[PDB]
Amino acid sequence: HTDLSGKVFVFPRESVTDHVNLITPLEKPLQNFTLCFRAYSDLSRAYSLFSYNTQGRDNELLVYKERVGEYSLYIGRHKVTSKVIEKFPAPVHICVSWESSSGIAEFWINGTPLVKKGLRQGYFVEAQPKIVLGQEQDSYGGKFDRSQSFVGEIGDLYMWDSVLPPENILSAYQGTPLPANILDWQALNYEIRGYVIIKPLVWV
Amino acid sequence: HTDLSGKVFVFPRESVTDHVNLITPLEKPLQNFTLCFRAYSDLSRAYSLFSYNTQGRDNELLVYKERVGEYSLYIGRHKVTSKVIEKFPAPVHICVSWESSSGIAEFWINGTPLVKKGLRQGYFVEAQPKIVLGQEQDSYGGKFDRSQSFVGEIGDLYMWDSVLPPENILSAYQGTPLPANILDWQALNYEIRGYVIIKPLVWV
């Protein structure tokens, strides 16, 4: 495991092949989760921020930016979208949580809550995933799409097997995140494939 | 009755089915009223905020948002509309009052008064209503329209049988409303039908 404190993944160009695999020892299906990270991109087209596929299941858990000010969450192929006022281009801190019992998905942008949406109530997101940054998966670990590639910088990424309350979301945004049990930036297991560079985080 | 202090109804999806029925013992026709509530939605299309129908009477009392920055009140099928500068998307506190003797409708958006309008002077809004949140009624308790459904969050809903002066509107906006005798968020009788989730209010 690697300590990425004060560092980002830079995806410096559009491609079909540049990506990072994120490795997690997750064996049981998810009833709850929270995912937080920082992103800086000047793409205007759609792109994937976080792609999580399982065997035979596309878009099992996908965070997707359709256009400026619009964020989408996919859970088992189904999707919700919430909107926000945002400057472009601008660095952004994104948190998203989902809770099976209610189906409620909560997007938080720069520590500010978006309108709640709901999907897949009672569903469990499948385990044994392939998780990739920089590309959107259409297969278990591949079938990428250049028009959906992420060009820019991603840092401070955390994933918890719980729904973070607002205080913990703000803590993540303001730079003191709670240690995370699925993915943790201070102890990340990753594989760089193609043109991805690790650099200091300079836009915080 | 239920105390919903610090909580909202979440209408997490577009549907023709999801709604909340609000129960009030109202047996006498309304001459005066004030209605306040908090709403958070990222719909750009038109939607119903508060739908009050009686037997044989559509839009007997309706608060309707035609588009961004435009608020409509219907009294006995008749309509008035007032405009406001507002950001989108954004949480909003809406208060609307109507007085039969003058016919004056008073919209207040985030503690700021809109231009007064007037309709149905001398009219009495009928009793024995069915009151719905989440959908727009075209019949007594039903005939909903998907394209008019409310998607998002509503809380701090209060209804008085009198016209509130500005200081009382401001108090409600600030989160310390006067006790209300038709509908009271802190003592609410309601029925959830379909996909509506009660969650803590995190956007104030």
Next chain:
Amino acid sequence: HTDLSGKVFVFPRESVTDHVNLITPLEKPLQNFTLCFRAYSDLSRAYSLFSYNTQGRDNELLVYKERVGEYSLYIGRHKVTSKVIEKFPAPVHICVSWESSSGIAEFWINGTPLVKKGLRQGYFVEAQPKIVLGQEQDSYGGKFDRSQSFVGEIGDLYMWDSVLPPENILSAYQGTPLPANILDWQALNYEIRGYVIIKPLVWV
């Protein structure tokens, strides 16, 4: 006669009928005047604010709003127009002064001077007027136009027989006007016709 301190006229709907007559015993033709008032409307189309006609003379003294950010003054059928940056919709305090010796017309919007314009130097505005609020006169007391009708609220109307200095205009905008000899909101003689309601001034 009537003290309308803290009160306004509400013209709650569009019509060709609803108006307020402003009665004055003015016998001498005016050489100098200043007229101040408060207005709040969300009309986008053109409308008349202050209509002053005499026998056989249309548009003898008219304050006309052609569109957002543009104010017109008519003196003896002749026209001047000055422009201003303003939000819409927004309450506004309008002062306008005219002086025969120079012809100079000064518009003041919310205590800010507009570009001085000029018209009808040497001319005198005829006396024995019919002064109306809420409609545009095309005859001596009548002949109204629906598309020119004022929908909204008017208050703090004052009219002096002299040209007010910048310091005296700012006092009236600040809510402490000097007493006025032609029209005085703190001692006004008026006539309500049609659907016009007096209410408290809530938007200051």
Next chain:
Amino acid sequence: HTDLSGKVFVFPRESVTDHVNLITPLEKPLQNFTLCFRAYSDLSRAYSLFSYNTQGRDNELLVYKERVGEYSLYIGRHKVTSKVIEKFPAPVHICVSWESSSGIAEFWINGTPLVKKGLRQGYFVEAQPKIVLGQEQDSYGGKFDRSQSFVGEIGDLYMWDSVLPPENILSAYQGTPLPANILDWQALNYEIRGYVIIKPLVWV
């Protein structure tokens, strides 16, 4: 001469005749000059601010507003233009300097420097001008153009036979200009022709 301290020329209407003649006793060719003045106009079309012609020579020295946010200087018929962010309509302080040896023209808008441009390096602007405010000259003292006429207010006009440094430009903007040897608002020899009115400066 006349002390015009705290006063403006008001050009109250669009015309082909209303102008002010400015008379300088200098009677010498110009190698260096700085011209500062205050202007307030709500014209959207192009207009002349300062027109300086010599016998047989049109546009010898001309300050010309093309459109909002665009200021032109003509030296001996050659033209430079510089851009600025400005509100419309708004009162403005304009300073412009030109130095023969370098050809450099320096526009200053509200004490803020525009991008330097250069023209007519080594040229001498001709002696014995007819200087006009309110109209654009095409002949020696005349051949005015209605569509180029200045409508609005001009005050605080000063002209030096030197290039003013930033500190001196700022002093003029602030309202404490250095004594001027070509044209001076505190000792100005002027001729009013047509409809031009002297009024106090109120928009500063």
Next chain:
Amino acid sequence: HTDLSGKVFVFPRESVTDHVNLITPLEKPLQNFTLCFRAYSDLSRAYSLFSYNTQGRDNELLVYKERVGEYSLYIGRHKVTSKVIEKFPAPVHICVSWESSSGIAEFWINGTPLVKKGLRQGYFVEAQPKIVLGQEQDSYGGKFDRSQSFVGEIGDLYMWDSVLPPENILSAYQGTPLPANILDWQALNYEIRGYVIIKPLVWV
């Protein structure tokens, strides 16, 4: 060498001829560099900011502004572009760094980092350059294009043979740059060709 502290190069007109040659003792191929400078221009069309060509090689190192809010860097005819929110017209401080080992190019605009891009990883930018300000080269020292010419002002130009950390970039922006070993504004060897004028920097 000249200490150009507090001074700018002014390119006062559009031309195909006016330019400055920048002379450097660098004879070693560059692996790493940082370039910082200040620019003030009101051009809306594309223009070259810094043109660096070698024998037989066009656009070996080029800083190019295609349009408002878009900055392009060329390394060996390969291009990356980054976007920023900026006012127009407005003075700008530009820093750009490039690193061969990673290919990472970093734009900094007024001390704010843009999204990192990547190009020409492993490449060596060729030595013995002709460096021009005011025109874009298409040959070794020439072949200019009027439509790519720079009109406006440039100052505070520095170039280091290393990738500067954020602190040193900010110091340059704030007006305390570190000594620079390729090009240094405080000890610059230059050649003015055509119409270029040295003036004091007034827009800082």
